[PDB]
């Protein structure tokens, strides 16, 4: 059987998640706020990966650190034409990136929504989210998980996930057995609730 990758899609509220892992699934939808999960399987290369996408509220939050055990890689999501949010974003990352479990674990950066006019190029965005000092292994793509009617998705989002998958995979023999353990010992610290 195919080696498996775990990855958690984050980002502030608003900032194209789901709509983003509805496009690179192939499927135009219609989305609301997550407040909760979706979670789907993607096939990319040798590697069957399972993508979390995780609502981005203020009062949702906090259960991303519950994922970031047991995730190989990350897909941080802006909008990038949103720069009155840069600033929650940044520090929204720097809280994921403060975490113990992200040590060495690569983020893919989506600049989402390229189509609006106001959209900040890589650039930006790298100045925004405050990257020049993040030692995680990063690259940022701009995309436009919603393109118009009838159009195809937009290539940039499969390029940004080959580049991660790619990243995994050079790592993953060092990579894979730190997050089985990792994982298996948050697991079984919240087996807890009982007590
Ligand atoms: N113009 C434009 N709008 C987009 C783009 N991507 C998403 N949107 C829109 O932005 C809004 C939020 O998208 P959605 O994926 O729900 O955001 P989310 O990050 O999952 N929000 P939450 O974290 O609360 O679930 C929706 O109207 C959606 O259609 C894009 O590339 N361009
Ligand atoms: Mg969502």
Same mark, same amino acid.
């Given at each position: 059987?195919?080696?498996?990758?775990?990855?958690?899609?984050?980002?502030?509220?608003?900032?194209?998640?789901?709509?983003?892992?509805?496009?690179?699934?192939?499927?135009?939808?219609?989305?609301?706020?997550?407040?909760?999960?979706?979670?789907?399987?993607?096939?990319?290369?040798?590697?069957?990966?399972?993508?979390?996408?995780?609502?981005?509220?203020?009062?949702?939050?906090?259960?991303?650190?519950?994922?970031?055990?047991?995730?190989?890689?990350?897909?941080?999501?802006?909008?990038?034409?949103?720069? #009155? *949010?840069?600033?929650?974003?940044?520090? /929204?990352? +720097? &809280?994921?990136?403060?975490?113990?479990?992200? =040590?060495? @674990?690569?983020?893919?950066?989506?600049?989402?929504?390229?189509?609006?006019?106001?959209?900040?190029?890589?650039?930006?965005?790298?100045?925004?989210?405050?990257?020049?000092?993040?030692?995680?292994?990063?690259?940022?793509?701009?995309?436009?998980?919603?393109?118009?009617?009838?159009?195809?998705?937009?290539?940039?989002?499969?390029?940004?996930?080959?580049?991660?998958?790619?990243?995994?995979?050079?790592?993953? #023999? *060092?990579?894979?057995?730190?997050?089985? /353990?990792? +994982? &298996?010992?948050?697991?079984?610290?919240?087996? =807890?609730? @009982?007590?």
């Amino acid at each position: 059987g195919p080696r498996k990758i775990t990855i958690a899609l984050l980002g502030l509220d608003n900032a194209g998640k789901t709509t983003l892992l509805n496009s690179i699934q192939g499927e135009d939808r219609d989305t609301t706020p997550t407040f909760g999960f979706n979670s789907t399987t993607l096939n990319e290369g040798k590697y069957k990966i399972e993508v979390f996408d995780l609502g981005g509220g203020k009062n949702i939050r906090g259960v991303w650190k519950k994922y970031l055990a047991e995730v190989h890689a990350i897909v941080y999501v802006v909008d990038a034409a949103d720069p #009155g *949010r840069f600033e929650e974003s940044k520090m /929204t990352m +720097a &809280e994921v990136l403060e975490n113990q479990f992200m =040590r060495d @674990k690569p983020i893919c950066i989506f600049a989402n929504k390229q189509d609006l006019p106001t959209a900040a190029p890589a650039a930006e965005v790298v100045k925004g989210l405050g990257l020049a000092t993040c030692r995680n292994s990063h690259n940022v793509f701009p995309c436009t998980a919603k393109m118009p009617a009838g159009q195809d998705v937009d290539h940039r989002l499969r390029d940004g996930l080959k580049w991660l998958v790619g990243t995994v995979d050079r790592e993953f #023999g *060092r990579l894979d057995p730190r997050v089985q /353990t990792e +994982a &298996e010992e948050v697991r079984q610290e919240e087996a =807890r609730k @009982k007590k």
